[PDB]
């Protein structure tokens, strides 16, 4: 059985930036997907974490789908900007709902979940590029975050974002670098058809985001921009300040964007990407520079180029995480290890390869893996041990 997503929304928060013109509540990506099951559910649950997760679990169980492996997805983009107590409480609430038991603290809920029935093998947080510094990242590690979706939308400072205030490309670069240096998965939100853009511009930037070492995310979450009633884009469309791409245009652009994605990239819509090769396989290696460090994409693929497993190995520019003296000053980061139905030992093979590369080719002391709490046991059975949120192992 595969991993089941559990997507929940945080409460409507005020705008992170002080501005008398800014809207009452911060703009979310879900403002333009108002008929999504999860956002309607969230509104009906008054945005309470526990209730949302419980409801979603019942729904999944009623569909006949598995719940042993779960990925938590925290939606909004402004969550990390809220009050700290609210953040820790919200996360704790989620784990409590997964566990079926209420714990004393967040750490107890996490430790309980390590062996619970509904394992949290991943935790994804949506955040804005400018709300993503060392402090926020450390909090995310406290939460047990495995993946971060950055609200990049489009990579040009002269293009209007869908959120208030917007952000700069530099912010995206910095946030991406920091996310990588802490061993997290990085996905970009990608909105083609934004005001002040063009299909050509969107295509060029799409090509650029996979060539520039400052960027190159692990995944793109494509949000095809479209005039949604009740939003500000509706007003701009009224005023003629904005005209959306025709269906054929947008579709063509999406196709062209899918046509240029590197092997190590996943594409999802709200094609030779990861998602599209899901399915004797052999081991493949693909190196590429990123954020001053090196990224190594290992995979298991057959002559049909169908994907069976992957591992993302980072050789970091610096050792930002603190793990004590036992694991040296130079450590590699396994930012992802994913394996399809069956296999399982393909994971063992990938990990062995990773350890060998880190020990021999790059002369690293240890390997650290930012695992989800429901996946920690897996790595414990491979010789890793929990240190400061990471699953670490000395290379010998």
CA-based end-to-end distance of the chain: 34
Could you tell which of ligand FES, Zn ion, none binds residue 19, using a CB distance below 5 to 8 A set by kind?
A: ligand FES
Q: State in angstroms the smallest separation of the CB of 125 from ligand FES.
A: 23
Q: Which is nearer to Zn ion, 220 or 358 (CB)?
A: 220
Question: Tokens standing for 123?
Answer: 């935790």
Could you give the C-alpha distances from 231 to 164, 236, 314, in angstroms and in order? 12, 9, 41
322 binds ligand FES (CB under 6 A): no
Sign of the CA dihedral 216, 217, 218, 222? negative
Question: Does 196 help bind ligand FES (rule: CB under 6 A)?
Answer: no
Residue in the block written with tokens 């610096």 = 318
Q: Token digits for 72?
A: 């938590």
174 binds, among Zn ion, ligand FES, none (CB under 5 to 8 A by kind): none
- DSSP lists the bridge partners of residue 9 as 75
Tell me whether residue 163 or residue 369 sits nearer to ligand FES (CB atom). Answer: 163
- Does 54 interact with Zn ion (rule: CB under 5 A)? no
DSSP-assigned states of every residue in 85-142: HHHHHHHHHHHHHHHSS--SSHHHHHHHHTTSSSEEEEEEEEE-TTS-SHHHHHHHHH
Nearer of residues 19 and 208 to ligand FES, judged by Cβ: 19
Q: Using the rule CB under 6 A, which residue among 21, 46, 85, 229 binds ligand FES?
A: 21
**Which of ligand FES, Zn ion, none does 370 bind, CB closer than 5 to 8 A by kind?**
none
Choose from ligand FES, Zn ion, none: what does 165 bind? Cβ within 5-8 Å by kind: ligand FES
Q: Does 241 bind ligand FES (CB under 6 A)?
A: no
Strands 266-269 and 219-222: parallel
Which of the listed partners (Zn ion, ligand FES, none) does 267 bind, with a CB threshold of 5 to 8 Å by partner kind? Zn ion
Site for ligand FES in 153-182 (CB under 6 A): 164-165
Q: Which of 5, 12, 14, 22 binds ligand FES (CB under 6 A)?
A: 22
The answer to whether residue 267 forms part of the interface with Zn ion (CB under 5 A) is: yes
Q: How far is the CB of 265 from Zn ion (least distance, A)?
A: 9
Sheet containing 307-315: order of strands: 282-290, 293-301, 307-315, 331-339, 366-369, 390-394, 385-387
Number of residues that bind ligand FES (CB under 6 A): 5
276 binds ligand FES (CB under 6 A): no
Nearer to ligand FES by Cβ, of 93 and 130: the residue is: 130
Using rule CB under 6 A, residue 231 touches ligand FES = no
Residue linked to tokens 């004393």: 104
Binding mask 269-308 for Zn ion (x = CB under 5 A): --x-x-xx--------------------------------
320 binds ligand FES (CB under 6 A): no
- CB neighbour burial string for 287-321, b if at least 16 within 10 angstroms, e if fewer: eeebbebbbbbbbbbeeeeebbbbbbbbbbeebbb
Whole-number Cα distances in Å, 146 to 41, 58, 88, 329, 337: 24, 24, 16, 22, 11
Beta-bridged to residue 267, according to DSSP, are 220
Contact criterion met (CB below 8 Å) for 53 and 94: yes
Token pair of 114, please? 């390590």
Q: Considering only 19-27, 87-95, 198-206, 299-307, which stretch makes contact with ligand FES by CB under 6 A?
A: 19-27
> Would you give the binding string for ligand FES spanning residues 103-142, x where CB under 6 A is met?
----------------------------------------
Closer by beta carbon to ligand FES, 23 or else 344: 23
Which residues does 138 contact at the CB level (< 8 Å), separation at least 6? none
Shortest distance, position 5 Cβ to ligand FES, whole Å: 32
Q: How far is the CB of 77 from Zn ion (least distance, A)?
A: 23
Q: Kindly report the backbone phi and psi dihedral angles of residue 108, in degrees, each rounded to the nearest multiple of 5, phi listed first.
A: -65, -40
Minimum distance between the CB of residue 58 and Zn ion, rounded to whole angstroms?
31
Q: Which residues make up the interface to ligand FES (CB under 6 A)? A: 19, 21-22, 164-165
Site of interaction with Zn ion (CB under 5 A): 267, 271, 273, 275-276
């Amino acid at each position: 059985s595969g991993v089941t997503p559990v997507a929940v929304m945080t409460k409507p928060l005020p705008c992170p930036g002080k501005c008398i013109y800014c809207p009452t509540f911060a703009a979310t990506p879900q403002s333009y997907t108002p008929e999504s099951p999860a956002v309607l559910r969230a509104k009906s649950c008054e945005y309470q974490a526990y209730k949302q997760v419980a409801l979603r679990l019942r729904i999944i169980q009623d569909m006949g789908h598995p719940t042993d492996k779960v990925e938590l997805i925290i939606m909004g983009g402004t969550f990390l900007s809220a009050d700290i107590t609210y953040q820790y409480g919200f996360i704790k609430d989620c784990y409590d709902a997964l566990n079926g038991v209420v714990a004393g603290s967040l750490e107890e809920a996490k430790t309980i979940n390590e062996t619970a029935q509904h394992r949290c093998v991943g935790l994804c947080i949506e955040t804005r590029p400018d709300i993503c510094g060392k402090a926020e990242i450390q909090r995310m590690i406290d939460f047990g975050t495995t993946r971060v979706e950055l609200g990049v939308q489009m990579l040009d400072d002269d293009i209007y974002k869908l959120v208030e205030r917007g952000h700069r490309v530099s912010d995206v670069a910095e946030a991406t670098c920091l996310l990588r240096e802490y061993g997290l998965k990085v996905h970009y939100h990608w909105m083609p058809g934004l005001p002040g853009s063009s299909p050509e511009k969107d295509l060029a930037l799409s090509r650029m985001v996979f060539e520039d070492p400052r960027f190159c995310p692990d995944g793109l979450k494509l949000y095809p921009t479209m005039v949604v009633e009740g939003t500000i884009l509706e007003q701009w469309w009224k005023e003629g300040r904005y005209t959306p791409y025709p269906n054929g245009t947008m579709t063509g652009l999406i196709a062209d964007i899918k046509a240029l994605v590197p092997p190590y990239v996943r594409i999802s819509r709200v094609c030779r990407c990861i998602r599209c090769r899901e399915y004797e396989p052999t081991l493949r290696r693909l190196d590429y520079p990123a954020s001053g460090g090196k990224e190594i994409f290992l995979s298991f693929e057959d002559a049909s180029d169908t994907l069976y497993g992957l591992l993302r190995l980072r050789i970091p520019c610096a050792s930002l995480p603190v793990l004590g003296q036992k694991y040296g000053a130079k450590t590699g980061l396994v930012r992802e290890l994913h394996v399809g139905s069956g296999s399982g030992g393909l994971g063992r093979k990938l990990l062995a390869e990773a350890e060998c590369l880190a020990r021999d080719e790059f002369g690293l002391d240890s390997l650290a893996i930012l695992s989800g709490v429901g996946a920690r046991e897996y790595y414990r059975s491979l010789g890793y041990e929990l240190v400061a949120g990471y699953m670490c192992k000395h290379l010998d």
